[model samples]
Target: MGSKIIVIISSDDTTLEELARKIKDEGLEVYILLKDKDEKRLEEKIQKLKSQGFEVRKVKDDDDIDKWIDKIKKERPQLEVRKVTDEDQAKQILEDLKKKGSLEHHHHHH
Candidate 1:
């Protein structure tokens, strides 16, 4: 495989829309995960994207983030996963392509 980029958006609607637009512009592929506790939002999003005629892959449940990373690594070892909080990182990740990548985001567990 030459390279693959996966952008996972969680809390940023504007950034997500912007990223999606850019991704479409680049003629890249977008995949959606379906099997999860909060299935409605994802389903709705997928439906919208599909209706809009964006060629995206719709996937299903697997595991938590760690397991997902592990699975991705098995096939795509040089994977770069980021968390999108603001526009800066998002722009960086979107503009720069890698073997495998994700949106920019950060989280704190208390």
Candidate 2:
């Protein structure tokens, strides 16, 4: 298969740094989207993620997604992109991850 796209939802303010750490702990690539209006918090959030000793990137649009998956074809996949939000907290988003028998992770030597 290796074709179906899994959309990873973005997160909001206050908990962005904590939120990204959770996903990265799950062993997935995470992208932090910095947008207009929330430029203030977005910049700080971007900087926090960058400084927190984690793997993340700042993006402005979905065009980056296209190029990202392109590399997935040649190498690997399993990524999650979340624009920093100003409304909902990380609690609400983590519940989405807990709502069902989804988001399973298995360890293997690679």
Candidate 3:
């Protein structure tokens, strides 16, 4: 019902720039381009992205919980990364994905 943020790592400058450009071109009300590296360089890159007419952000500390949730929901919806109102149904869906090899098994505890 609200805004969603997605963070993706670019393989190269071309790929990164292209993706960023495309997102801006889509006319999304809000966007965030995060620098994957350190502080100074990160700030510089974020500025560059913004200068290109895209919304850019630099994360300062350990984890941006808000961004993390948004990134997962936006990027990996299959993870059911947002909320599971019905855990039973979710578990069934996950099992189905596993049996079909759509999702790799992570923990035996599950």
Candidate 4:
């Protein structure tokens, strides 16, 4: 088989630049799924990533919810979806994925 995809989900800008760089240094595909809370500032950084040649996926705040599905199938074929909240989580993702294979979640109730 091929490599697994990494999707970073965050409402804020989060650690996109640093994370993307680190992930890329590892030669892994890092896709950003942004919430678009602030388009202007976000675009500024997005453009920076563009300079380095990266694809940033932006979901509309209001859409028919179709394109994203299409996007996933088209771009991220057979991709594994996981949420890495921060850098260390990403590091673990690298270790777990590189050293072996995985996906981790929590079981909690409120």
Candidate 5:
């Protein structure tokens, strides 16, 4: 399986940072999707992660989940893409990661 990339839709800096730290601890990659807001804390978190030599990118927001999924599929063709929004999907993604050891077997689409 290829490297997994979990794309999270969130604006919660603290939780995102905590989750990012945990994912990093597990030796996996994570990308936090913010709404391009003016949150200083969010900027700080992004800066901190970037300072650690992590790659980050910004993309135009879309209301359609399908479009977002397609964008991910095209933009990050190399990485296994998992776009998560709700809590159930979030838990399931983590569970899938734990079970299959990657997003290679993630069949639940959203």
Candidate 6:
């Protein structure tokens, strides 16, 4: 099998779950980020998903996006980090998503 890429999803709980599901469905391992609303509930969900043999991981503390990039590099060095902190990055992400048809309706509902 090919090395799986790390998708640094910094979205909410629902988005994280949906993305994880999609990644797992693609037979790729996933590491998802979650907000610290409640540590216990977050850990519980992470564990539950891990138990299902999904290779799920919980990512927190966004003090260094580059550090996460490095770790993912170590694991899958060929993988690229889709840094979308600016317009260029955003455009790149959109283009890539368009190529793969992963860009669904991601507008905020709240």
Model 3: per-residue Cα lDDT at residue 32: 46
Q: Name the candidate, 2 or 4, with the larger lDDT value.
A: 4
Candidate RMSDs in Å, in order, are: 6.0, 8.9, 11.0, 4.6, 4.2, 6.8
Clashes of 3: 0
- How far out, in Å, is residue 62 in model 2? 3.6
For candidate 3, the 10 contiguous residues with the lowest summed lDDT are 80-89
TM-score-wise, the better of 4 and 5 is 4
> What C-alpha lDDT values do all the predictions have?
0.47, 0.44, 0.42, 0.56, 0.57, 0.47
In model 5, residue pairs whose N, Cα or C atoms come closer than 3 Å (at least 3 residues apart or on different chains), thus clashing, are none
How do the candidates rank by TM-score, highest first?
4, 5, 6, 1, 2, 3
lDDT of 5 by residue, 2-98 (tens): 4777766554434543455455445567666554466665556667666754444444463554476678779777776666554455555656666
lDDT of 3 by residue, 15-110 (tens): 544444443233323344354555666767767767866565555432463455467567755433322112332343334333433244321122
* Candidate 1 overall lDDT versus native: 0.47
Where does model 2 exceed 4 Å of error? Answer: 1-12, 27-29, 36-44, 63-74, 77-110
Q: lDDT winner among the candidates?
A: 5
- lDDT preference between candidates 3 and 6, better one: 6
Ranking by lDDT: 5, 4, 6, 1, 2, 3
Which of the two candidates, 1 or 2, achieves a greater lDDT against the reference?
1
TM-score of each: 0.48, 0.42, 0.41, 0.59, 0.57, 0.53
lDDT of 1 at 105: 38
Candidate 1, residues 1-110: lDDT per residue as tens digits?
32444444433154554475665455454443333346677567666756755433344433354455456658766544333334455565566554233334333122
Candidate 6 lDDT over 1-110, as tens digits, reads: 34344343433334444444544454445555443467778777667666754454455555454466567777767554433222333343434443553344422121
